[PDB]
Design a protein around this ligand. Structure first.
Ligand SMILES: [Cu+2]
Ligand SMILES: [Cu+2]
Ligand SMILES: [Zn+2]
Ligand SMILES: [Zn+2]
Lengths: 151, 151
């Protein structure tokens, strides 16, 4: 059981690579093979709706907005760590992008399973993720730069 | 059950911060609060001996050498991922250092427990960690830059 997800830059509309999802004894592993991203730590989460289309919010366009909020089947309404149960189950460890703009560092999500991810969108944000709604909500990820639908 | 470990730069001999270890349902969490480190991804592992003293290797001095190799109670003799069982149980996820030389991104080790860590050394390497003995052994961490004994 292994799946590959195509990731696309929402700003340019061009592909940036793929992410392989595999199931193992300790949870779901996300193995990235991305490029053309800004160096640093990027917010990385699974979102509710399976779509990367835009959305409208008070007159302004929201790239990746159709993806909705963070996957939260427990209805926790809080953003947190990948190893805490009182927050979005869609909260994954932050995504690392090297100096050359490449991301190849695999991350583990202990609270997730492969079967429940189908039909959900994988998001990559511009900012990082301190896994808290403070000082900024949703860990401070801000804008959504890359997105892909898990099918 | 929470422990704090003092980390010291092996080259300068000066402290660089602390790392808090806590036990949770999914494993051991390492919460770093370090500074004065080089930006980028650093190899991060638990070593066999509880010491950060130097060692001698074919006439050359080895900073942090007294720490021995990677914690490997299973005697796997292989270096790998934190979520694979056929490799050093001391293999942790790589440590991220921001542009300002600070490391505050918590990491999870699903295969570890707090009680077995006492008496072991926590190591931070100069290079990164691709979690494989190829192309470079021990994931390519190279020299040991920071070390601390878990007591
Ligand atoms: Cu998100
Ligand atoms: Cu090491
Ligand atoms: Zn969240
Ligand atoms: Zn190892």
């Amino acid at each position: 059981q292994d799946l590959t997800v195509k990731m696309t830059d929402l700003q340019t509309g061009k592909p940036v690579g793929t992410i392989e999802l595999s199931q193992n004894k300790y949870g779901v592993v996300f193995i990235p093979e991305l490029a053309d991203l800004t160096p640093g730590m990027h917010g990385f989460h699974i979102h509710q709706n399976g779509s990367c289309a835009s959305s409208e919010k008070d007159g302004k366009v929201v790239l990746g907005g159709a993806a909705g909020g963070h996957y939260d089947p427990e209805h926790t309404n809080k953003h947190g760590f990948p190893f805490t149960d009182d927050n979005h189950k869609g909260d994954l460890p932050a995504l690392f992008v090297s100096a050359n703009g490449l991301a190849t560092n695999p991350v583990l999500a202990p609270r997730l399973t492969l079967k429940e991810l189908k039909g959900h969108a994988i998001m990559i944000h511009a900012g990082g993720d301190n896994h808290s709604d403070m000082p900024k909500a949703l860990g401070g990820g801000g804008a959504r730069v890359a997105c892909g639908v898990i099918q």
